[PDB]
RNA sequence: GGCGGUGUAAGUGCAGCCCGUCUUACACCGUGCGGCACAGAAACACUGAUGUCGUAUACAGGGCG
């Protein structure tokens, strides 16, 4: 019934802004309050913000306030983190968490959005170089080299492979670019009847690219 | 500004076991604590609010307490499924504060890597770099090392590792080393062998390939 | 309720007696303020009850055997 959709995320420089959107439905914003948690990739949560019901009172981390704002739309039921100055410890994914009723959950924030990714950074965003890593059961995969900020998606065969795949987090390689590489183990029978096609997209750059893998 | 400092920051346990995660407020924060659940790459969970009362939906085998400013999530019983990232929070006093998190990975029999070896792309040899590619897939526990040797000569500072995390459905782990080379220095050697030490193996193996082949 | 005002009575600075002041009781009249609990979709703010535990001028001495 409840739902929380965000979205506003990405890339910018340092010193630079954006504003994080929540979408609520199944419940009216104006009753609850409303907070932000970020999480650095590898860390743990950090609460950044919220909002209280009926007061419109707001309260910010020590790290963030007089630089990110948070805000609600009462008409479009939509709450907002508007982040200014930013920098490269910023960098992380963000929530909107929904603190729940009192009676029924106390102060514990019962429902999350999605989260959505802030990269703080100077370097320029690159699309990625896909290559094959042939047949060795067997193993095989995709190299997915050279490309900024993250993320990159994998799937193999349109998603109807899934069983035995391994997609690795990606490594920053002194070039300041990403690398990971996406494998998957299968019987060896099925390499002359199934063919087998990595799809990666990399949509901070718009690049989306469908690579066949074959026996070398 | 209220500290909650989270121990242990992780733990392995076996299926069925008792686990007890605690979380120590640095002044009081009365019962105003909550604890969660969070999965890689997901939202978190809220599994206990009110320091103590079970949020609906949780099984039963999860439960809260506090002894004044001491706050303690128990898992009567671990299951498969439980395997985690688990925080508490205090929501006394802004700025809210979170515990630093208690990582849960579930204990399993040792298992060797199985390693494969990827020579670099024909696609790739045209651009200048070649990257050489080691596969450790399935293995448990996590720690594991590899060497890389071109023409027997052992490699450093020229490759980077990465390792998912811990398999649902078997609890094991992988791992990928990519060694970076010029196409040059690629194209002139010709025995390319990644060593791999781990707890599953008495002694290090090695899976190489010839240039060519 | 507590506090204050006024009135009536009794007791009360002495070796003793008297007046006052002081205390207590009763009567009527004014009149609150905090802290902490609770609830309202509710951490603050806002609204509403009811409890509790507390609070507030440190002006008294004189007369006669």
């Known amino acids: 019934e409840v739902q929380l959709v965000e979205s506003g995320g990405g890339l910018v420089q340092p010193g630079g802004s954006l504003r994080l959107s929540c979408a609520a439905s199944?419940?009216?914003?104006?009753?609850?309050?409303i907070h932000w948690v970020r999480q650095a990739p590898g860390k743990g949560l950090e609460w950044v913000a919220s909002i209280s019901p009926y007061s419109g009172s707001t309260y910010y981390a020590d790290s963030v306030k007089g630089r990110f704002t948070i805000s609600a739309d009462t008409s479009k039921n939509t709450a907002y983190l508007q982040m200014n100055s930013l920098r490269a410890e910023d960098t992380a994914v963000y929530y909107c968490?929904?603190?729940?009723?009192?009676?029924?959950?106390?102060?514990?924030?019962?429902?999350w959005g999605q989260g959505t990714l802030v990269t703080v950074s100077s370097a320029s965003t690159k699309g990625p170089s896909v290559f094959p890593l042939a047949p060795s059961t067997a193993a095989l995969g995709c190299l997915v080299k050279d490309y900024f900020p993250e993320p990159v998606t994998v799937s193999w065969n349109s998603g109807a492979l899934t069983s035995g795949v391994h997609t690795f987090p990606a490594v920053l390689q002194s070039s300041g670019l990403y690398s990971l590489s996406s494998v998957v183990t299968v019987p060896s029978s099925s390499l002359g009847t199934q063919t087998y096609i990595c799809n990666v997209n990399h949509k901070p750059s718009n690049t989306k690219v469908d690579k066949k893998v074959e026996p070398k | 500004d209220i500290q909650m400092t989270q121990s242990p920051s992780s733990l392995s346990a076996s299926v069925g076991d008792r686990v007890t995660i605690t979380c120590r407020a640095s002044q009081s924060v009365s019962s105003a604590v909550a604890w969660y659940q969070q999965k890689p790459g997901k939202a978190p969970k809220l599994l206990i609010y009110?320091?103590?009362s079970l949020y609906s939906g949780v099984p039963s085998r999860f439960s809260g307490s506090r002894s004044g400013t001491d706050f303690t999530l128990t898992i009567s019983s671990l299951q498969p499924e439980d395997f985690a990232t688990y925080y508490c929070?205090?929501?006394?006093?802004?700025?809210?504060?979170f515990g630093e998190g208690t990582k849960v990975e579930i204990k399993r029999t040792v298992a060797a890597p199985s390693v494969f070896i990827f020579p670099p792309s024909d696609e790739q040899l045209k651009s200048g770099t070649a990257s050489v590619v080691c596969l450790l897939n399935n293995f448990y526990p996590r720690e594991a090392k590899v060497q890389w040797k071109v023409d027997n000569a052992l490699q450093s500072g020229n490759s980077q590792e990465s390792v998912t995390e811990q398999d649902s459905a078997d609890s094991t782990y992988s791992l990928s080393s990519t060694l970076t080379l010029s196409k040059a220095d690629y194209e002139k050697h010709k025995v390319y062998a990644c060593e791999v030490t781990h707890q599953g193996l008495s002694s290090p193996v090695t899976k190489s390939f010839n240039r060519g082949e």
């Open positions: 009110s320091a103590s």
């Open positions: 968490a929904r603190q729940g009723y009192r009676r029924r959950s106390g102060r514990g924030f019962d429902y």
């Open positions: 199944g419940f009216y914003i104006s009753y609850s309050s």
């Open positions: 929070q205090q929501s006394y006093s802004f700025p809210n504060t």
